[PDB]
Amino acid sequence: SEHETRLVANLLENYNKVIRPVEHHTHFVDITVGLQLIQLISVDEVNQIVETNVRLRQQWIDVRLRWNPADYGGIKKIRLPSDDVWLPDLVLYNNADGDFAIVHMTKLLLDYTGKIMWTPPAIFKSYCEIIVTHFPFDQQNCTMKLGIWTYDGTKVSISPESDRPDLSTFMESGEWVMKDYRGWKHWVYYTCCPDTPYLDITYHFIMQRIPLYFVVNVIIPCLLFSFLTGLVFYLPTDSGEKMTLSISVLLSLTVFLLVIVELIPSTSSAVPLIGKYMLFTMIFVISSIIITVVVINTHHRSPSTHTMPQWVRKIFIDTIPNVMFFSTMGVKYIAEHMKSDEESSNAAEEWKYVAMVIDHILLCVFMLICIIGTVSVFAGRLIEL
Amino acid sequence: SEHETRLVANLLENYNKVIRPVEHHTHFVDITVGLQLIQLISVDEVNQIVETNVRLRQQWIDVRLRWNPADYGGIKKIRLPSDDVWLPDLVLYNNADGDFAIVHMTKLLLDYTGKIMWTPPAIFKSYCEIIVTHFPFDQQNCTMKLGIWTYDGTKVSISPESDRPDLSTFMESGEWVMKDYRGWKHWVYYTCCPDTPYLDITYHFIMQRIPLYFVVNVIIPCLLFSFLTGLVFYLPTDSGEKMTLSISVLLSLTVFLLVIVELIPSTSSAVPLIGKYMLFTMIFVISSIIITVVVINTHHRSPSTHTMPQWVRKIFIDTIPNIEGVKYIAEHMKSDEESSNAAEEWKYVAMVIDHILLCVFMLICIIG
Amino acid sequence: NEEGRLIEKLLGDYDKRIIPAKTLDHIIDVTLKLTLTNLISLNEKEEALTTNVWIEIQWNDYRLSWNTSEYEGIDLVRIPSELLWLPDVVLENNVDGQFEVAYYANVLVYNDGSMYWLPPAIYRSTCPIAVTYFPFDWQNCSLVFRSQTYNAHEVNLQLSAEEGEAVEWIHIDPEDFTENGEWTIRHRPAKKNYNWQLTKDDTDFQEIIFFLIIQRKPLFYIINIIAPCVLISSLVVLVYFLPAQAGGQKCTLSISVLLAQTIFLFLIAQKVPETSLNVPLIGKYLIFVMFVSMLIVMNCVIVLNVSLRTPNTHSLSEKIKHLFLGFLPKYLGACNFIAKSTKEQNDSGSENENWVLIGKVIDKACFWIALLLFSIGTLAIFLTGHFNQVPEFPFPGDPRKYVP
Amino acid sequence: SVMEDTLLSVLFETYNPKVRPAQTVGDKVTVRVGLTLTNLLILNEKIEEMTTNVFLNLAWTDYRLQWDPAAYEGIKDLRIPSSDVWQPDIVLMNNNDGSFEITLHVNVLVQHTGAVSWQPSAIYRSSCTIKVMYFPFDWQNCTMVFKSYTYDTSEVTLQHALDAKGEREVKEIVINKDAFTENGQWSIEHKPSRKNWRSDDPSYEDVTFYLIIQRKPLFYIVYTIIPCILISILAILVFYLPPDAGEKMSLSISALLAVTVFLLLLADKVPETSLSVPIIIRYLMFIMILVAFSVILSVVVLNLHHRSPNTHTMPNWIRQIFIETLPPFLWIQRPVDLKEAVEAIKYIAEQLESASEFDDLKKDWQYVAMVADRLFLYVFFVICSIGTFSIFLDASHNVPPDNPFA
Amino acid sequence: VNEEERLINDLLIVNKYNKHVRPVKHNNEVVNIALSLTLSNLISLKETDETLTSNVWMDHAWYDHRLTWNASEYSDISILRLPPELVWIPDIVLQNNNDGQYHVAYFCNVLVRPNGYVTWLPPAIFRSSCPINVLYFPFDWQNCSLKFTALNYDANEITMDLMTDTIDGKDYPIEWIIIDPEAFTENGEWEIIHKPAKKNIYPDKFPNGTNYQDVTFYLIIRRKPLFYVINFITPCVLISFLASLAFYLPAESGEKMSTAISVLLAQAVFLLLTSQRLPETALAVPLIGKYLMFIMSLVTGVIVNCGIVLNFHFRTPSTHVLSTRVKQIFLEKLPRILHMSLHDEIKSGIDSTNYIVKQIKEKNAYDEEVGNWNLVGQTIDRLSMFIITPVMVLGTIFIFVMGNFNHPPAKPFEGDPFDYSSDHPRC
Numbered sequence A: 001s002e003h004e005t006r007l008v009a010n011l012l013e014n015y016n017k018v019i020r021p022v023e024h025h026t027h028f029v030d031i032t033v034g035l036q037l038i039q040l041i042s043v044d045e046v047n048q049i050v051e052t053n054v055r056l057r058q059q060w061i062d063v064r065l066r067w068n069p070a071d072y073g074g075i076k077k078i079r080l081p082s083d084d085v086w087l088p089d090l091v092l093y094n095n096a097d098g099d100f101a102i103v104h105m106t107k108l109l110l111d112y113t114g115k116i117m118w119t120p121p122a123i124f125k126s127y128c129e130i131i132v133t134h135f136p137f138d139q140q141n142c143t144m145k146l147g148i149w150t151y152d153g154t155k156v157s158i159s160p161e162s163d164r165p166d167l168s169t170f171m172e173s174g175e176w177v178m179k180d181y182r183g184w185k186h187w188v189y190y191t192c193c194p195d196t197p198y199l200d201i202t203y204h205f206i207m208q209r210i211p212l213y214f215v216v217n218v219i220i221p222c223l224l225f226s227f228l229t230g231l232v233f234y235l236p237t238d239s240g241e242k243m244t245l246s247i248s249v250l251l252s253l254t255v256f257l258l259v260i261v262e263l264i265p266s267t268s269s270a271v272p273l274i275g276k277y278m279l280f281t282m283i284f285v286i287s288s289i290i291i292t293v294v295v296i297n298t299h300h301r302s303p304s305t306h307t308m309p310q311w312v313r314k315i316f317i318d319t320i321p322n323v324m325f326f327s328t329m330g331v332k333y334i335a336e337h338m339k340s341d342e343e344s345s346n347a348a349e350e351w352k353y354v355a356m357v358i359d360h361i362l363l364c365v366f367m368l369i370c371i372i373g374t375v376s377v378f379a380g381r382l383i384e385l
Numbered sequence B: 001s002e003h004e005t006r007l008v009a010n011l012l013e014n015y016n017k018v019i020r021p022v023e024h025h026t027h028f029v030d031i032t033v034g035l036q037l038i039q040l041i042s043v044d045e046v047n048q049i050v051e052t053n054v055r056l057r058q059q060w061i062d063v064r065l066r067w068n069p070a071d072y073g074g075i076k077k078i079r080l081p082s083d084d085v086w087l088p089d090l091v092l093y094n095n096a097d098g099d100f101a102i103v104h105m106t107k108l109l110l111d112y113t114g115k116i117m118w119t120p121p122a123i124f125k126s127y128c129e130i131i132v133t134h135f136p137f138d139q140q141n142c143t144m145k146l147g148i149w150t151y152d153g154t155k156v157s158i159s160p161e162s163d164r165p166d167l168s169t170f171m172e173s174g175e176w177v178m179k180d181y182r183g184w185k186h187w188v189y190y191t192c193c194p195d196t197p198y199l200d201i202t203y204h205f206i207m208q209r210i211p212l213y214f215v216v217n218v219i220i221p222c223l224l225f226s227f228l229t230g231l232v233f234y235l236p237t238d239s240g241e242k243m244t245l246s247i248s249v250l251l252s253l254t255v256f257l258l259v260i261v262e263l264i265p266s267t268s269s270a271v272p273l274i275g276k277y278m279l280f281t282m283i284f285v286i287s288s289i290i291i292t293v294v295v296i297n298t299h300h301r302s303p304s305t306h307t308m309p310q311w312v313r314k315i316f317i318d319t320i321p322n323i324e325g326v327k328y329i330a331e332h333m334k335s336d337e338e339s340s341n342a343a344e345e346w347k348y349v350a351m352v353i354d355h356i357l358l359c360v361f362m363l364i365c366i367i368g
Numbered sequence C: 001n002e003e004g005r006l007i008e009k010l011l012g013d014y015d016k017r018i019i020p021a022k023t024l025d026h027i028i029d030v031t032l033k034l035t036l037t038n039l040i041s042l043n044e045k046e047e048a049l050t051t052n053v054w055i056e057i058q059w060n061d062y063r064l065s066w067n068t069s070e071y072e073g074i075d076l077v078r079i080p081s082e083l084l085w086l087p088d089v090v091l092e093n094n095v096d097g098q099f100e101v102a103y104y105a106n107v108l109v110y111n112d113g114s115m116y117w118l119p120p121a122i123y124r125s126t127c128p129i130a131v132t133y134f135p136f137d138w139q140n141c142s143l144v145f146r147s148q149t150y151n152a153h154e155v156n157l158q159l160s161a162e163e164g165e166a167v168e169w170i171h172i173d174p175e176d177f178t179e180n181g182e183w184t185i186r187h188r189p190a191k192k193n194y195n196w197q198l199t200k201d202d203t204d205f206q207e208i209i210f211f212l213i214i215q216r217k218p219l220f221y222i223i224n225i226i227a228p229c230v231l232i233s234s235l236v237v238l239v240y241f242l243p244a245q246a247g248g249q250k251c252t253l254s255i256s257v258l259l260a261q262t263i264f265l266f267l268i269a270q271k272v273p274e275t276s277l278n279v280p281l282i283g284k285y286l287i288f289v290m291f292v293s294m295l296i297v298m299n300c301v302i303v304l305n306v307s308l309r310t311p312n313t314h315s316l317s318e319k320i321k322h323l324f325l326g327f328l329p330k331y332l333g334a335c336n337f338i339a340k341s342t343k344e345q346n347d348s349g350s351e352n353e354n355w356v357l358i359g360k361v362i363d364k365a366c367f368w369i370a371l372l373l374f375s376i377g378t379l380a381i382f383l384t385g386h387f388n389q390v391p392e393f394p395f396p397g398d399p400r401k402y403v404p
Numbered sequence D: 001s002v003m004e005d006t007l008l009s010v011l012f013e014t015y016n017p018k019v020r021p022a023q024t025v026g027d028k029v030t031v032r033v034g035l036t037l038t039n040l041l042i043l044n045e046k047i048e049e050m051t052t053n054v055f056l057n058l059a060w061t062d063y064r065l066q067w068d069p070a071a072y073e074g075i076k077d078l079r080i081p082s083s084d085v086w087q088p089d090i091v092l093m094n095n096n097d098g099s100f101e102i103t104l105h106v107n108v109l110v111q112h113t114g115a116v117s118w119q120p121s122a123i124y125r126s127s128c129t130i131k132v133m134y135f136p137f138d139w140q141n142c143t144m145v146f147k148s149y150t151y152d153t154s155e156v157t158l159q160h161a162l163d164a165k166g167e168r169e170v171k172e173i174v175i176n177k178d179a180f181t182e183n184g185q186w187s188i189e190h191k192p193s194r195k196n197w198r199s200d201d202p203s204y205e206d207v208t209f210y211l212i213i214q215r216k217p218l219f220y221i222v223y224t225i226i227p228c229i230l231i232s233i234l235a236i237l238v239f240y241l242p243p244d245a246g247e248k249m250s251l252s253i254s255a256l257l258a259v260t261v262f263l264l265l266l267a268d269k270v271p272e273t274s275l276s277v278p279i280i281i282r283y284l285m286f287i288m289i290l291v292a293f294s295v296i297l298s299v300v301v302l303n304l305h306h307r308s309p310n311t312h313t314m315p316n317w318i319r320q321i322f323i324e325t326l327p328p329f330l331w332i333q334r335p336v337d338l339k340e341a342v343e344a345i346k347y348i349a350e351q352l353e354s355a356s357e358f359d360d361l362k363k364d365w366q367y368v369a370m371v372a373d374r375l376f377l378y379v380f381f382v383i384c385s386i387g388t389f390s391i392f393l394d395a396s397h398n399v400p401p402d403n404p405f406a
Numbered sequence E: 001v002n003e004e005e006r007l008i009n010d011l012l013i014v015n016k017y018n019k020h021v022r023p024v025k026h027n028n029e030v031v032n033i034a035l036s037l038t039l040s041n042l043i044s045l046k047e048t049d050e051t052l053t054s055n056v057w058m059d060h061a062w063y064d065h066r067l068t069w070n071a072s073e074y075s076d077i078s079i080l081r082l083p084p085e086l087v088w089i090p091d092i093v094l095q096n097n098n099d100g101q102y103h104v105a106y107f108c109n110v111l112v113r114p115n116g117y118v119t120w121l122p123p124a125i126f127r128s129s130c131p132i133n134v135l136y137f138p139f140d141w142q143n144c145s146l147k148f149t150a151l152n153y154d155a156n157e158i159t160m161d162l163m164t165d166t167i168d169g170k171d172y173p174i175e176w177i178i179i180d181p182e183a184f185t186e187n188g189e190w191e192i193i194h195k196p197a198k199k200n201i202y203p204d205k206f207p208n209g210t211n212y213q214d215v216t217f218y219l220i221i222r223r224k225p226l227f228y229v230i231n232f233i234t235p236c237v238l239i240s241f242l243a244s245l246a247f248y249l250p251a252e253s254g255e256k257m258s259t260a261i262s263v264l265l266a267q268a269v270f271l272l273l274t275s276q277r278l279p280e281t282a283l284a285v286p287l288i289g290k291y292l293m294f295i296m297s298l299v300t301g302v303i304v305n306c307g308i309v310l311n312f313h314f315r316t317p318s319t320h321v322l323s324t325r326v327k328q329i330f331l332e333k334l335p336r337i338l339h340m341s342l343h344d345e346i347k348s349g350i351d352s353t354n355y356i357v358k359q360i361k362e363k364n365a366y367d368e369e370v371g372n373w374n375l376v377g378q379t380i381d382r383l384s385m386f387i388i389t390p391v392m393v394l395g396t397i398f399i400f401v402m403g404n405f406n407h408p409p410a411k412p413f414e415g416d417p418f419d420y421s422s423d424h425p426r427c
């Protein structure tokens, strides 16, 4: 268009992009800043970073760029490269990866009254400290702090477009749900510049993790192995394979501990409930193994070198009525030897019986302990309401 | 300063950076080139890529950039930016992932006689064919090949600053130690340009790996399992748990072999000595497992259906060790005694075989 | 806007390629001040320290000086850094190729020529990781700032001053500081350093070093690695109470303990650098417990061998029988053929009983030995991990504290 | 001098690339947008990002770039640098990374009538939502959205690209038979294109190219399904093993460990999104539960086998169920000084008789254990077969539709 | 002073050189660009990413009549070096690349001769995308390609073609990848069997569309399998032999199943480690993967057979009878084929002795029945061994011989009798 060509030539003739668009240097530029979250790209928990795709819409009035539409053939809006006009320098304060400011520099809409409407895209890889206490049933509240860097509040003023960031076109995360989101404006005084307040806007998001993936992939096998640890007591010590089951479950829990450690950050601010549950389960397994070795030793305890004390006989013969289950409530030398053999066999059967009674008691108490422990560990956060 | 402003304005007002800084086109602009290593960032063995931090010192005489200090207030140095003067195009011919030439383009010192010294930094990710024969006690010798890539011997005539690269400020790697390092100058003829010799300088570093990390993380557990290999024989066959121990040791050794495979590159130039030793230990474990299965079968070899060979009963037994009142039970007791004696002979044969294998393992451990 | 006229007047006869020295032999005083906003991470595998900082570079440029009376009392303007001469202060000890700052913010220039530049940066500095006392270790990292182009005859690197007192620290700002979690900053001194191996015209003669002495908080590691490892390794002494009568599975338990310790060794390797200058304390403990477990596997094999000995294959001499039965435990605490068969089987049974008694005595003695060894090793390792605190002073010889 | 140089000098004496080519105020520049897929590089499910190699066939009309070929020695077309002419900011709004614009920036072709045609090549990492169900027997629907970043419907009018002949308009992704390599993992079932409008704002228009791709499930069948079927066979075999041989645990828990290892080494191939559970992970869950119950019932069988009349007394209901009720169904039918010497023989005979009765009771307990073992074997076999067949049947029933619904 | 400054000022400034115009005297004429490739180093071939990363020198040659001068008029200037940003260069780009790298890594200067001949030899690190055929892994040969096309001009404006060399007065096209002996490092894992180069014309396209011409350089590279053999094949076969001979373990010892189960677990571990060292493609099942699947199935069959043997060994006459057919088969036939190696008080005592003898007889009969069952179990063990070990050995030998017989073709193209070798130019 010849009219638009003349208009662009006229506007960008004595225009200096270095200087602020104020008429008098005493005044300030009020930039209306809104952030819209197109997509939550990722939440890296180990590195405590959130990658978000955003559009950083911002509007401000530049007096030097106004014109009369009737002169230039009734043109009321044009589009200009952002490199040709003065741009506010928004910087993401909290930042881990990527640049601090906008780097794409897309074109901007210029209204005939000087109303610039620059909406550039960005990917904010912003640091944000995650609370790993309730894992994986946690909600992460964390923010993006955008502020004008080299200008104080008396020369460049930033103002939020709305109380909340725009999520009209926000893609569903598939891993988090946005419980809440809000932007707040702060006048902060820094040690650099104590006499002038710098303005910033912090947009904070609450993201509640959907735990279905982590539950199925981690928690269910751990519960299964805890149940197997509880079960190991019902196995008869005569068959063997008891230590086999115990050590197999211990190795499985060690592997799952490694897997969980690879997931959560190494911070010590708060111990995760998943970590303390792993520790509880491992202590449970160790106690089961120790008392299992005790039971095995008592079962194979020699009936000759170990005389059965009276107190164990009393306790583990009168305990059975208290428990309601399926348990029971030359010509002469050969005869002498086999009589002694059968007497020793019965004495060993007494030790086998007390070992079986201990096994039943341990089975009951360990099933109860497993159920109570898992309920106490998980129902604290599972009951959100 | 105003004098330096006038000097910079006058030097570059009719200066063309395209043309070489030579009075006559038949001459060559001699360039003194030196390397200064700062830190050995990494040696990726799997991809055979060595990442180093270097500074590339280059000195040459630019005749056009000469001035009289007395006119410009006694100024003798300028410190111009590099993007304003002719720069030699040194290219790392061995690049494997990164830039072939210098990309930082820092400022360069400019003397009043025309001498120019430019020391840009660089991150050289060069190719490094690693000899994996020894491990984790390897010694790596891979080079950096710097040429000019556009001019020949009669145009730039590169030259080395010193016989050895400067390591006066080299940060200690911790994982590698510098044994030797030296730079050599070569005149090479390529298929492109057979009638013009292209000059280059190759700087080679000999790095000796510090094996403490790999020793602790691999060799010690591998040695423990290799020692556990021989405890199978001393373990009685009556207890069971023999095949379990042997198989556990074998699986551990296979896991560590896979770890070693993940550590070393996939080249087939030479087999690592650690890999060869691991394979030999696996062979020994397999042989021990076979002998253990034979010994178990011998121990449980009932005499009711299997007779006792005569040669075995010779060697392994003698040479290597050095109307209702019918008594139906007496004859069966005698037969059971005979069968038990034959079974005991089988037990003794198994024990002798186990002790012989244990002695063999002890001799192997002693010689190792 | 008078700023337009002022800036077009300043940058008229001005070029950024020339150091603003007043005359010949005039050194520009460039002063630095770091501000640590967030210690982002310390990646051990790459031996890198990633920090978010604001660096304050302050100098004087006589060319950029004006008269406030002629410009409606304007005493401060912002000029893009790309249009001005910069001292080219760079981080020398960077793992990557990033030498200069990330953003290149504007420079505040005053009427007298004072230049104030405060760009933010993400610095991936390099520092060797002293992994001797991991995870109860403290790391002494540093950020070194030099002038990439100018030498000591042209610029003069210095630390910032407030009221005559030079800022000798990193100046954590309360408004915008965030704790790193696992790492806590015990000391943060700053110091100008020289080389003395180079003359003062080599651009590396002068440096400014900001030291971060940080301490790892080991509660996470204690809960997730050390405690499970100690609990699992404590099972290897439990093997001496299992029976040796072809059951109880002593070998399976001991080998499973060894395999679990190997898994923990792999886990440790997945969190420790490959520095190889020293072996980590947790790594030393893992090697010790694996060696103890191997010895206990040997002991289990020997006990199974002794307790399963029969009078056929082995003869129980009285010198060994009496020694292991009467002394150490106190210190430790047609019928003719039928009778012959019964006696001959009872003799073998008695020999087997004596052998299993010898095995049990050996089990008790070796259990006490192994328990003492394991307890002493664990206590020694995790007590020398303790009693290892950050030094009281930042630089050890100096009596200064280097704190605000 | 070449007439091309003079033509370029005359053509760009006052041309401004920053102003939109509107003949009169209020006109719209119709931009025809098409896509040519040269190589679908990959579809990373971990980050839900499809990277592809494409050519963006853009066409528009610039009234300023007009000339008379008769007056310039017959120059009917020119190939000129892309940066010297105006161009719509046709970008991929769907990009997962920050790359919106083109990678290559080839020269634009201009005819003497002003018809500009630009076909720049690019590598696009578009954001594709992944439906997790049915993996790895899945059919993904990845969209690439193209529109002018800076120009809306009041300034440009997006259209579909024309064919090689001008009369036909292409409504689909054009795949060149040459220079196209089929992906070894995905097959292009449908590749339609459509113009999209969002209601409540009549200043928005997209051209969306849809890739409906069906995954070829091999390398998943072979490497996960068949080993898991073998592990399931082992879990079933657990019950046929006799309790007397001490290896029921060593087999069942080993199978459980194998399934868990398969899970943990498959965790790096499925997306972390948790809208639903994929078919393969659900099948792994089923196998884990089956093997765990196999372990539990093997423990129960071992406990039953080692019970003794001295330690346990068989309840009446246990005997009724497991002696004369189930074995008929399972075909496990059971087949069917002198005075001192005298006292010694009588005592040992009585002891032998008592031991015989004790052994009879112990054999009754072992028979109950064996009957329970066979019952569990049959139940586990039928349950495993039915579950596996049903899961893989409904997985095989999943095919992409016929009408893409563009 | 230097004459190069005057020469360049005359060529580029006085003559008003335009770098955005084709070096053609007048339009409707083609600028022919000769193209050649030199392989300095084949950096890597990642099968998981299916990428070929190579270090190349990409030589271009053409004519630019505007860059013509009289040598004797400029004090005999023979060669000139000019930056690419000052002169027109043909933009030849690698069309098939995984990353967004189309051009060369470094834009080195261009060499111009007084006749207008211009040559350009920039280096490049090219990451091209070639599909990986894993049918015979690790004894496999890959066929990777690098396709270069001119997208700034159509075939009616510039014409790509292979660079030509001259031997004893005859010119031949260099239809192969040049390997300079002074600059080339062997990969150590891949050996270049064939390195052809072709100029492809597609008649189905039009000359005015930039899809008409390509220049393709092919690398047929055979993997040297010694590393993979030593580090994966030998341990797997050695472990499989353990399951092969697990039948030799007697049923009395409670470790018969454990050995086979552990061997199966090792085979699964090897399978899952192999799966990661190959692309996630469904074109074919890898040779090593197919062998491991066969071995795992056979070991599972071995485990099932061992379970059957254990079940047949521990069955008792109290629960299981011994059928006539089972005896007549397993006790006799198969082992032959397989060549297996006072007053009333004393009366009560007599009755007590009678009961003792009867119990001894019953125990002896029970012992003989369980012994018959044990012998049946051993017979089944021997039969399973002699039916499983040979088939496993034969399968392993056949699979690995078939893999080792996989060799790259003698000619690089099926229908082309010519061998694209540097030693036999066609001229």
Ligand SMILES: *[C@@H]1O[C@H](CO)[C@@H](O)[C@H](O)[C@H]1NC(C)=O
Pocket: C067, C068, C069, C070
């Ligand atoms: C600055 O302005 C004041 C008042 O106009 C004047 O007195 C003084 O001389 C000026 N100084 C300079 C250096 O121009």
Ligand SMILES: C[N+](C)(C)CCOC(N)=O
Pocket: A148, A149, A150, A151, A190, A192, A193, A198, C105, C106, C108, C117, C118
């Ligand atoms: C706003 N703040 C304090 C973070 C940076 C200010 O830097 C300046 N004054 O340029």
Ligand SMILES: C[N+](C)(C)CCOC(N)=O
Pocket: B147, B149, B150, B151, B190, B192, B193, B198, E057, E109, E111, E119, E120, E121
């Ligand atoms: C000689 N060589 C191959 C290293 C560089 C060739 O580049 C030229 N001369 O253009």
